[PDB]
């Protein structure tokens with residue numbers, strides 16, 4: 001039995017590359033054998049059956065004469081190994097040795113071209129790309145809060161949300177770093193800064209409208225045991241591998257269309273019948289309008305440089321590659337335990353995590369600076385190895401996107417609002433807001449933003465009233 | 468006659484003209500030193516020397532003396548470094564072109580302890596454009612003025628400390644126009660750290676306004692650093708309004724802050740000696756304490772955060788990517804941007820060196836929006852690295868640190884002054900809250916909180932501020 005690269009080159013006969021691809025090879029054989037023997041999912045639920053079928057899948061691979069075709073690009077995977085050997089030291093920050101996981105994924109197929117499993121398989125065998133699960137934190141926000149709210153037509157690109165101080169149900173303040181919050185802001189600013197309260201209100205709105213949020217997340221392969229959590233949009237109650245989470249940003253980057261992640265393409269018996277072949281099941285999870293609007297937002301998350309120095313780092317390493325159409329989002333857990341940076345061009349998504357195996361804190365700036373700088377170095381290694389793999393294509397608004405002229409101040413169409421009895425003529429600076437519904441944005445009404453108390457609205461309307 | 472590098476290697480021999488940047492700059496300055504020495508030797512008075520045909524005669528005589536004579540001219544120019552600077556601009560200059568044309572450039576590397584100029588960049592390519600953008604060009608230093616003319620003086624005079632609050636509330640010039648910053652009429656109260664990081668304008672306006680109300684001799688300070696500003700009675704002076712400088716002079720103001728407040732006059736010539744042994748000129752060390760050590764070291768701490776905040780420069784990010792270990796040196800700096808983005812400045816120091824940097828167009832037209840935020844910052848990280856590669860210890864590993872004379876005060880985040888009770892317009896109030904350490908350069912430290920706790924701000928501003936404070 002043999003395991004090969006995408007081109008056919010032998011990886012090995014039956015150091016992360018071996019164990020990862022063999023393991024997935026095995027899971028594939030497992031499904032196949034259980035299918036071959038008509039084991040129902042009840043018996044499959046059973047633990048000693050599980051052990052038996054696992055063992056049988058493994059021997060079937062050793063004893064069989066199987067050709068196992070992987071999706072791994074040798075040059076690219078190899079360059080990624082070198083990148084982490086050469087530049088992994090950039091992660092270490094005086095909190096101990098910082099572990100890393102990266103998965104490089106073709107956005108149009110979901111194939112995985114290469115990955116980084118950890119700083120050094122010899123030193124530490126944990127596989128941080130495929131096995132370790134950590135809260136994805138704020139990188140949850142585009143997928144589960146904002147993207148869904150837009151796809152449902154509850155929100156456009158320049159909609160306003162409350163970042164006024166507010167409490168969880170226990171009465172503790174919702175915090176972001178040191179801040180209890182500020183006031184109204186646009187989706188764009190909420191996203192660039194990664195504020196927490198606007199995300200809380202958004203998911204709260206989705207529950208109020210009874211939106212099938214599980215539907216969305218499950219179509220991307222996400223398994224979240226409990227959706228009834230106030231901090232869910234922030235990453236609370238969620239734990240994901242780098243591979244699975246990469247698959248989510250693949251969905252946004254591929255114009256809303258999911259392709260299931262995979263590292264095994266084909267398994268052929270000695271006589272050459274396919275025991276397993278990868279079967280494309282493209283799923284439209286977000287509308288093309290919603291995914292393309294989200295792309296324009298996530299472009300500016302990087303551009304703005306508020307929570308990541310990535311675009312600066314990359315410019316200094318390779319100004320040409322800095323000009324590809326990068327979009328992305330960062331994540332940071334509450335005690336700086338885990339940092340994420342997810343990056344896409346139209347062709348590829350590169351998911352990246354860092355943290356400690358025992359879950360203890362990183363440095364304040366581990367995500368903003370170190371992982372950003374390490375990931376720029378990695379992206380540049382992938383380029384050198386395979387020089388047009390990223391592409392210079394641009395993300396663009398889908399024709400079905402609807403434009404609205406809204407007031408900058410309310411994110412809604414200008415007109416008459418009643419403000420404590422005195423009805424007023426809301427006028428002023430306007431912007432183009434992008435929506436994914438039919439009618440675009442509504443007329444401005446008193447409760448114009450996502451979230452906010454009465455005290456907040458009093459206060460906010462006061463400022464707008466300074467006409 | 469020969470001009471050499473600091474180590475004695477010959478840059479060039481000087482011959483009469485028939486009828487790069489490095490040659491003409493050093494020659495032009497050698498000539499200025501010979502001018503001084505000839506007027507001297509002939510006892511011409513500096514009033515006699517205001518006679519204009521007399522400038523001409525003594526300038527021509529100084530040119531001739533060098534041409535004819537057998538003079539050894541020792542410059543301060545470090546050959547490997549200067550050479551690395553010329554390669555860096557040739558290799559990375561293109562990073563400055565942003566779509567508005569051929570972006571010109573001036574850089575001056577200075578030793579903070581002596582004022583010696585180790586190297587410079589005169590421009591993009593002497594053979595295409597001979598204008599010397601390091602020594603000749605004068606442009607507004609824009610916001611890079613603020614630490615020198617506004618905040619550093621106010622701290623020095625005891626009128627403000629590291630965590631003093633200043634107004635950024637909307638305010639007008641005397642002519643009724645709003646003071647603008649980018650596109651913003653302003654915000655509210657903010658710390659000195661925030662005013663400096665974002666480079667707001669209203670806090671500098673109020674700072675200079677204070678200095679003027681106090682009768683502070685701002686001119687005294689600036690002139691001790693060699694700055695020539697014809698009119699100090701300008702509202703926007705602390706933003707760079709009514710100031711034009713060369714990169715060499717302006718690098719010298721930053722050298723003064725970096726050197727714990729002690730100015731050394733910039734120079735490119737260290738010695739002229741004749742074949743017979745006469746030393747016709749030798750650089751005389753003349754250190755001047757322009758700001759106190761407490762002020763300069765306080766200012767150093769704030770300028771460290773200007774760069775690390777990355778608000779108006781990507782520099783520390785660019786440099787981290789090029790050379791992480793070099794990025795860990797103790798960098799401090801300030802950016803400048805003129806109103807229409809005509810001119811971008813970035814000034815950088817470690818304890819050992821100051822590197823000034825300007826970009827812009829010879830004809831003064833606009834650069835792109837991010838020319839200084841990103842392009843200059845990235846080109847200068849490349850320059851700082853090339854200097855490093857040429858001379859790996861030259862930037863040094865020393866840290867900037869508070870002088871012992873600095874006075875520390877425990878102060879309210881919200882007011883910048885000691886906690887206590889305040890006349891909040893009938894209803895005496897007890898001000899409590901978040902505490903921070905504030906550094907002062909005086910004897911006594913910060914005040915107890917007064918009603919008017921900030922630099923600047925109207926009656927209505929203070930109603931607004933105090934209302935929001937009290938809400939605890």
Ligand SMILES: *[B-](O)(O)CNC(=O)c1ccccc1Cl
Pocket residue numbers: 135136137138139176193194195196231234235236237330331332333334
């Ligand atoms: B975001 O990563 O910028 C901020 N996220 C959080 O604060 C978050 C992360 C994990 C669990 C819960 C929360 Cl609120």
Ligand SMILES: *[B-](O)(O)CNC(=O)c1ccccc1Cl
Pocket residue numbers: 607608609610611665666667668703706707708709802803804805806
């Ligand atoms: B600073 O460069 O960030 C802001 N400075 C200016 O706005 C300025 C520049 C030159 C002349 C006058 C002004 Cl206000």
Ligand SMILES: [Cl-]
Pocket residue numbers: 015016017018081117
């Ligand atoms: Cl590997």
Ligand SMILES: [Cl-]
Pocket residue numbers: 005006007008009072073074075
């Ligand atoms: Cl391959």
Ligand SMILES: [Cl-]
Pocket residue numbers: 168170172
């Ligand atoms: Cl809580």
Ligand SMILES: [Cl-]
Pocket residue numbers: 211212213214215227
């Ligand atoms: Cl749900």
Ligand SMILES: [Cl-]
Pocket residue numbers: 221222223224239240241244
């Ligand atoms: Cl999952």
Ligand SMILES: [Cl-]
Pocket residue numbers: 226227228
């Ligand atoms: Cl639920």
Ligand SMILES: [Cl-]
Pocket residue numbers: 024261262263264265
């Ligand atoms: Cl697979």
Ligand SMILES: [Cl-]
Pocket residue numbers: 303311
């Ligand atoms: Cl950018």
Ligand SMILES: [Cl-]
Pocket residue numbers: 153437438439440
């Ligand atoms: Cl609709």
Ligand SMILES: [Cl-]
Pocket residue numbers: 487488489490553589
């Ligand atoms: Cl030169």
Ligand SMILES: [Cl-]
Pocket residue numbers: 683684685686687699
């Ligand atoms: Cl004066």
Ligand SMILES: [Cl-]
Pocket residue numbers: 693694695696711712713716
């Ligand atoms: Cl001057």
Ligand SMILES: [Cl-]
Pocket residue numbers: 698699700
């Ligand atoms: Cl005056």
Ligand SMILES: [Cl-]
Pocket residue numbers: 496497733734735736
């Ligand atoms: Cl000189």
